[PDB]
Amino acid sequence: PQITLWKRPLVTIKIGGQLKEALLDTGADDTVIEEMSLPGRWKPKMIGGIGGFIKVRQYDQIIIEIAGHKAIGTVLVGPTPVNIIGRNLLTQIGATLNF
Amino acid sequence: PQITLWKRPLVTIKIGGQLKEALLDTGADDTVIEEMSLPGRWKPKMIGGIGGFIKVRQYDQIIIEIAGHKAIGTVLVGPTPVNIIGRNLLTQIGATLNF
Ligand SMILES: COc1ccc(S(=O)(=O)N(C[C@H]2CCC(=O)N2)C[C@@H](O)[C@H](Cc2ccccc2)NC(=O)O[C@@H]2C[C@@H]3CCO[C@@H]3C2)cc1
Ligand SMILES: [Cl-]
Ligand SMILES: [Cl-]
Ligand code: NA
């Protein structure tokens, strides 16, 4: 698709068999989702957003559908106002910005 | 142009007579610029993201040149770690997300 930006670019994602809403976020390096359970081991990571740095759980090689496109990659779990799909997975689904 | 997302989507902007680098950010509702002087009236605002909220100054009807495209709109000024072009100005240059 071609998504305009008059509204927030929210899409449906599927992770762990559950549907969630997430924001396509070209200003995010990383994908950050709200607390949920994911399989496997996690590693620590600190990310710095607009208000400061927070700790998150980094899970690698997680299967995630984004707007109907399959991605497999790193998901950070921690307190974010909204689930955000960052460039690590936007690249996997072939997204570009155009103007 | 078509901008891929392997790297941060940074562009040159001109605002207040000043050249700056800024992120094209589909996850940002509003445009947020690091501390600088702008003319006219302003009002305080709080904006929030990962890590919490910061206090900013809201300036209305500010012209920004974004990668050579002129736009006008509200610009927030405050202690953001990065300059952010948000959806309120991305729409005006006709930016879309494509995949
Ligand atoms: C109302 O207007 C705005 C409100 C908030 C922001 S924001 O900068 O907090 N942010 C909002 C996003 C994230 C939460 C949400 O609902 N939408 C814009 C983001 O693109 C932000 C833009 C950003 C803010 C601060 C630093 C770098 C980028 N990136 C970001 O938080 O990425 C996180 C932090 C890590 C650094 C970059 O990637 C890592 C993942 C911008 C304008
Ligand atoms: Cl505006
Ligand atoms: Cl349009
Ligand atoms: Na003004």
User: Sign (positive/negative) of CA torsion B84, B87, B93, B95?
Assistant: positive
CA-CA distance, B42 to B24, in Å (whole number)?
24
User: Which method, experimentally, gave rise to this model?
Assistant: X-ray
Cβ pair B48:A81 closer than 8 A: yes
Domain count, chain B: 1
Task: Looking at the CA of B73, name the nearest ligand.
Answer: 2
Residues 6+ apart with CB under 8 A from A39: A16, A59, A62
Q: Which residues lie with the beta carbon below 6 Å from any ligand 1 atom?
A: A 23, 25, 27-30, 32, 47-50, 80-82, 84, 86; B 25, 27-30, 32, 47, 49-50, 81-82, 84, 86
Residues 6+ apart with CB under 8 A from A64: A13, A14, A15, A31, A70, A71, A72, A73, A75, A89
What are the two backbone dihedrals, phi and then psi, of residue A35, each rounded to the nearest 5 degrees?
-50, 130
Enclosing domain of residue B41: 1-99
Is B10 an 8 Å CB contact of chain A? no
Which residues from chain A sit within 8 angstroms of residue B70, using beta carbons?
A: none
Task: State the resolution, in angstroms.
Answer: 1.3
CA-CA distance, B65 to A4, in Å (whole number)?
20
Chain mean position to CA A27: 11
Looking from the CA of B20 toward its CB, the CA atoms found within 13 Å total 20
CATH number for the domain that contains residue B27: 2.40.70.10
